[PDB]
Design a protein around this ligand. Structure first.
Ligand SMILES: Nc1nc2c(ncn2[C@@H]2O[C@H](COP(=O)(O)OP(=O)(O)O)[C@@H](O)[C@H]2O)c(=O)[nH]1
Ligand SMILES: [Mg+2]
Length: 171
């Protein structure tokens, strides 16, 4: 299999861990605080296939890339765990990918915007604005929920869809 050094970004008020944890631990913890920090190593199943992946959780208690700054050197793909119920992180995403493209190398890395807890209704962040910003970074806006693990798979599979796809489109 291949390794997909993933990296999570966005506010911690959205559910940064729960999304990573789920996709890896495969279970919900709803206990991860906005300070812990660890990488989840485990292969998954991409478009019906599979690829060794490693999603970093990233902490907060700082400002932006000050939390997950120790792995950006290999940041293979960044997943924006913003919640459609907290535009806050949302404003924080544009700033997140901003620092990313800086540490990585350029401003065209494989990342995807996702509205976590989309299950219920609510939506402090305008839905139109969610896809809109996704078009700004060139990434798609997937709406999932770390609790329903329903979109979480297409959230981490879309980001890799950008990575895992390059290896071939190359030619
Ligand atoms: N219902 C529901 N709850 C969620 C979801 N994602 C996260 N949560 C919960 O919302 C709470 C707030 O998330 P938070 O702890 O701030 O996320 P984190 O610190 O960034 O990892 C957590 O305790 C989670 O259990 C989701 O998709 N659905
Ligand atoms: Mg946490």
């Amino acid at each position: 299999m291949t390794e997909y050094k993933l990296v999570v970004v966005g506010a911690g008020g959205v559910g940064k861990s729960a999304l990573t944890i789920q996709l890896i631990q495969n279970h919900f913890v709803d206990e991860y605080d906005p300070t812990i920090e660890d990488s989840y190593r485990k292969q998954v199943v991409i478009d019906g296939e599979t690829c060794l992946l490693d999603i970093l959780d990233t902490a907060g208690q700082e400002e932006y890339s000050a939390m997950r700054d120790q792995y950006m050197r290999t940041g293979e793909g960044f997943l924006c765990v913003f919640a459609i119920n907290n535009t806050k992180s949302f404003e924080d995403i544009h700033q997140y990918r901003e620092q990313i493209k800086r540490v990585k190398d350029s401003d065209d890395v494989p990342m995807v915007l996702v509205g976590n807890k989309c299950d219920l209704a609510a939506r402090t962040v305008e839905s139109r604005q969610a896809q809109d910003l996704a078009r700004s970074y060139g990434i798609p806006y997937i709406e999932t929920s770390a609790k329903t693990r329903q979109g979480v798979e297409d959230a981490f599979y879309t980001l890799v869809r950008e990575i895992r796809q390059h290896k071939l489109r190359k030619l």
